[PDB]
Amino acid sequence: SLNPRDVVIVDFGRTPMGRSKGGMHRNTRAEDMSAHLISKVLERNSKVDPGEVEDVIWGCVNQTLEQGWNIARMASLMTQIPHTSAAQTVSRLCGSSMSALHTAAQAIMTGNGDVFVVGGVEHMGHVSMMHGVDPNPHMSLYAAKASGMMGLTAEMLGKMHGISREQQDAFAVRSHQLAHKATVEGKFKDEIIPMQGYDENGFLKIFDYDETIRPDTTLESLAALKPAFNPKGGTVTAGTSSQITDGASCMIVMSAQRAKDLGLEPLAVIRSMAVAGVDPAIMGYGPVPATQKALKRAGLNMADIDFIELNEAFAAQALPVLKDLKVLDKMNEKVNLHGGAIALGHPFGCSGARISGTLLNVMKQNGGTFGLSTMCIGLGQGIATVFERV
Amino acid sequence: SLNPRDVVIVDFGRTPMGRSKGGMHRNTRAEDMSAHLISKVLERNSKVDPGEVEDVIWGCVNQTLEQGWNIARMASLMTQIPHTSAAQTVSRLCGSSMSALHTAAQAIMTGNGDVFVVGGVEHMGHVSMMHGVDPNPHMSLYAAKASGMMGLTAEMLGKMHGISREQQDAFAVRSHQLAHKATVEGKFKDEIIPMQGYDENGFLKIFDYDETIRPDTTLESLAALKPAFNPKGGTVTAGTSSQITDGASCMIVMSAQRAKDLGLEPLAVIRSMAVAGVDPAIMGYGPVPATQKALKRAGLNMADIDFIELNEAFAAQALPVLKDLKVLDKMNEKVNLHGGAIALGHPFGCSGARISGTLLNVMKQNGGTFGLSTMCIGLGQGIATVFERV
Amino acid sequence: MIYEGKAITVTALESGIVELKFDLKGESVNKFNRLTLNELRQAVDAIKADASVKGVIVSSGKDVFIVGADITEFVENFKLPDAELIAGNLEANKIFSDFEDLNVPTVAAINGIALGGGLEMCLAADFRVMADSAKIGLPEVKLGIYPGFGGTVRLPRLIGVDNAVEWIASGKENRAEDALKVSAVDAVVTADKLGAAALDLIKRAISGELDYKAKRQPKLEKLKLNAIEQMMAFETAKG
Numbered sequence A, B: 001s002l003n004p005r006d007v008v009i010v011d012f013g014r015t016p017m018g019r020s021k022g023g024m025h026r027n028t029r030a031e032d033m034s035a036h037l038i039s040k041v042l043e044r045n046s047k048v049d050p051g052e053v054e055d056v057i058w059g060c061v062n063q064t065l066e067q068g069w070n071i072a073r074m075a076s077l078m079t080q081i082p083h084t085s086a087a088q089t090v091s092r093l094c095g096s097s098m099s100a101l102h103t104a105a106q107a108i109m110t111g112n113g114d115v116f117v118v119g120g121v122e123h124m125g126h127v128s129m130m131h132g133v134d135p136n137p138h139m140s141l142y143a144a145k146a147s148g149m150m151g152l153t154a155e156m157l158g159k160m161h162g163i164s165r166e167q168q169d170a171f172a173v174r175s176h177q178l179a180h181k182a183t184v185e186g187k188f189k190d191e192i193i194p195m196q197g198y199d200e201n202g203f204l205k206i207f208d209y210d211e212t213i214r215p216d217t218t219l220e221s222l223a224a225l226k227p228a229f230n231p232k233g234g235t236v237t238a239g240t241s242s243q244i245t246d247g248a249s250c251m252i253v254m255s256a257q258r259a260k261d262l263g264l265e266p267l268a269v270i271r272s273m274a275v276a277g278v279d280p281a282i283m284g285y286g287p288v289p290a291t292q293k294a295l296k297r298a299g300l301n302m303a304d305i306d307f308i309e310l311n312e313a314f315a316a317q318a319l320p321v322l323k324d325l326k327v328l329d330k331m332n333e334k335v336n337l338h339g340g341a342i343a344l345g346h347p348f349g350c351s352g353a354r355i356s357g358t359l360l361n362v363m364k365q366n367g368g369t370f371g372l373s374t375m376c377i378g379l380g381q382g383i384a385t386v387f388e389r390v
Numbered sequence C: 001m002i003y004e005g006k007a008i009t010v011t012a013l014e015s016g017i018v019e020l021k022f023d024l025k026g027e028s029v030n031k032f033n034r035l036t037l038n039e040l041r042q043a044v045d046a047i048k049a050d051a052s053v054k055g056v057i058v059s060s061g062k063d064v065f066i067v068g069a070d071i072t073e074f075v076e077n078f079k080l081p082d083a084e085l086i087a088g089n090l091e092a093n094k095i096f097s098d099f100e101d102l103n104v105p106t107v108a109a110i111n112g113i114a115l116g117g118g119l120e121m122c123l124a125a126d127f128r129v130m131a132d133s134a135k136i137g138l139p140e141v142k143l144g145i146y147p148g149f150g151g152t153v154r155l156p157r158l159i160g161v162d163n164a165v166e167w168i169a170s171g172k173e174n175r176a177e178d179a180l181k182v183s184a185v186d187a188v189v190t191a192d193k194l195g196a197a198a199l200d201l202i203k204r205a206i207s208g209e210l211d212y213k214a215k216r217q218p219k220l221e222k223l224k225l226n227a228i229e230q231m232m233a234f235e236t237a238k239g
């Protein structure tokens, strides 16, 4: 059964991923985006008292300007979450959002809380991924300064694993299509939380879809693209890469016991968590080391998992992962069924729980039992979670 | 006895707090400061294999420029810590460093690790506390924009609790005095880790003391100071406030079992952890709510604790805390014995574990049993830990 | 047309929506004098009585939206006995408050400058779309007074205490860019596509897409700030 201290997910809600370049969130702050998302998610589950939120753990990378000074609290203050509650912003680069989920869980398990709210935000339109970056010369002494440029780290993993430009563009058109497909069939309605935004002309209106998705993507169009990172002989292009997206994800978590008391069916139950490190140069390979550690803790075999949600950092990196994980042949059958970051974007601070959330829905929709959400991280890291519907 | 999953502190080491305005760290980066400190602390305890560092949790607030992009990993990469290990940067404003300790502990307890390295850095000389700050107008709608200016939040708590300018300045001269005292008697030798720095002229040399400490401080000199925050009728001045310090703290933590195996006497054993929230205006009152929660979990009474280490954010705030905690009368007997942030500085990302570390030494020196490290946080938060020598 | 005055004309539009436009005949601007007010009173009563109206839009047929009244009239009004002045402003405010209580989504199409009463009028409506070149402000303190038509009431509940004080105490004119950043205006457009943006938004408000009833509520209830935050935010503002 469920032990009183097990980590139960009560709900998951994400904002409609928008284009950073003059998109639907161009006039919306990162904080007001997060504070909002959280407010709405809570309103859906009224049986949970916001006053019980032991701690608001939010994930955010470029913690400067709007995203500076523990944005977790800045958001919690503009919510129905009392001042009595706490708040902390976790940063583990791309995996920030997912580490938050872990941190809270661990808290719930150790008996230092009962109801936490974890999420993540990242407004790349207002805080460019290259804003305020001071390269430390002393890094070149112990590592490669080039290992920083995420695109190149995809290039290397691609070559070492021999991923062709064709293979990549193909996976790209797949993400877009599958994403679009799921959007239409409203497979995203349950997780997407409507939100005020502004169209081209700047007209205020509500969005319930993802601007990022580009259904007009074809091998013929992605072939025209030029290497975005390696000029002379590049494979990774702007088309097989994740999109610069302004977005936020949210989740309500609590012990299994508290969940039992309030009486409400879990969206899933975390069974294991893990993180791992890899060389900065081949950071895209992070998922495999972390996945293994996670499964071993879960006491399962990669074959026991029904659905997978691997964040699509790069095509040249996502593919090798699946391959080495020995699930590439099972892709279209159980991998990123609702599309990935190539079509949904990759809002650093957000992505973490985002895929972890979407993964739960894919399970609730196709009757899954065990799901796996994993993703590579910058500078060489990996993180994955293993949930179970029950 | 000690359960196999108990959180044991193996050691604590901090850098010589330096003056941000042309101090000993003026030419030292935040990363290289952290990566260094960590390297040295590990070298002291050779029985612990750096390859076992499950995760490097570092605390840092102004995560931009040097301190941007998960500085936790940036440091771990320039250490003997393998690439296989992970790393995340926790931000909870002032309490960042202490939350890191908690996160790891919780990890060790849940069985998702065995040996973690937690610390915190904050180079306020290179990343001013007011650098890259975009005030959100929508905040004024749910809270007071003024609650941001930390100094004013001290003013308010001071008035509400009637703390006089005399009382503050007095507590100030106390911090410097006791800090200087402890420095001399080498009560800081064990925790301070020598480090390359540059004196006035810019001569490269090693520092093993704290520049911040100013022994020539007297009620007569602090009386001359002028209100730093409230012009007409101010009580909080630049003298009763923490110093802008460039510093970093480090700690090695691991399960009680792993500690048993490797065979090494614990520096202390975490017994409880907690966080709490308060109104942004009176954020300085955060310690009391968190301390209560912490003790209640520890199953102890404020009277069972032998020594306390309360971070000295402001005199006007530190005093009320002690009072309401019902330990003010026990101050000089068991409170900030080696001085506080008023004389040692307050490097946001660092302070957290810094006082937590110093507290352990005060116990190891005066034969203490249970210690309490607590501190207020910006925007209204509190955090405290309760260790035990045994 | 539903209503036809000398300063205000309530013309009917599509889908039962209606446009209330400020076009003071004979002058070059728009100001709240005795006439303007008395007409807006009638204009509202017409709408409020017309059970066909489903949406209201507030526009201006001049280069500016609505500037301040003739300083001349000011001198006059402030000469009246206290009990009379207040009684005069109470009636004036009711005109706005009533327009604020219309069981129909209302949008202010700020095309140009909107000072004092001009801005206070907009503060009454639910949503607000402003031109990218327009400006809005409350230059009351420059005359030794402060917002009289519910300015000190709506502004704080719309943009926030700290901002409301910063806007009123200075009486500075605020540009479109900063106007949306503090949420004084919901949407910003260009002079040529303003009418479109307004008309569009209304339809969405009517369609139920946007909860106009929930957007109005905020300025009908007490401030959001805590008790500590009030004192904090206020005592500092005063200081």
Ligand SMILES: CC(=O)SCCNC(=O)CCNC(=O)[C@H](O)C(C)(C)COP(=O)(O)OP(=O)(O)OC[C@H]1O[C@@H](n2cnc3c(N)ncnc32)[C@H](O)[C@@H]1OP(=O)(O)O
Binding pocket: A094, A129, A150, A151, A214, A216, A217, A218, A221, A222, A225, A228, A237, A238, A239, A241, A242, A243, A244, A283, A311, A313, A314, A346, A375, A376, A377, A378
């Ligand atoms: C570790 C982890 O888990 S996360 C991995 C980290 N990933 C990242 O940081 C993302 C890095 N990528 C980026 O920053 C950007 O996308 C870049 C650098 C690759 C490209 O940015 P830019 O240099 O500005 O070039 P840009 O994006 O404008 O080029 C895209 C062009 O291709 C076209 N294009 C892009 N995607 C598609 C598509 N799917 N179908 C058709 N055309 C497309 C665009 O229309 C555009 O052409 P245009 O200029 O005529 O409009």
Ligand SMILES: CC(=O)SCCNC(=O)CCNC(=O)[C@H](O)C(C)(C)COP(=O)(O)OP(=O)(O)OC[C@H]1O[C@@H](n2cnc3c(N)ncnc32)[C@H](O)[C@@H]1OP(=O)(O)O
Binding pocket: B094, B129, B150, B151, B176, B214, B216, B217, B218, B221, B222, B225, B228, B237, B238, B239, B241, B242, B243, B244, B283, B311, B313, B314, B346, B375, B376, B377, B378
């Ligand atoms: C929530 C938490 O837990 S943390 C609380 C957060 N706290 C803060 O953010 C406050 C941080 N402090 C500050 O930012 C600064 O110290 C301020 C704003 C208070 C004052 O800074 P400034 O305006 O630059 O004044 P400054 O720091 O130069 O010092 C003022 C004078 O007092 C003197 N002074 C300071 N301390 C002492 C002392 N102990 N003895 C004698 N003289 C002293 C200085 O030498 C200086 O004199 P000088 O100019 O002749 O050299």
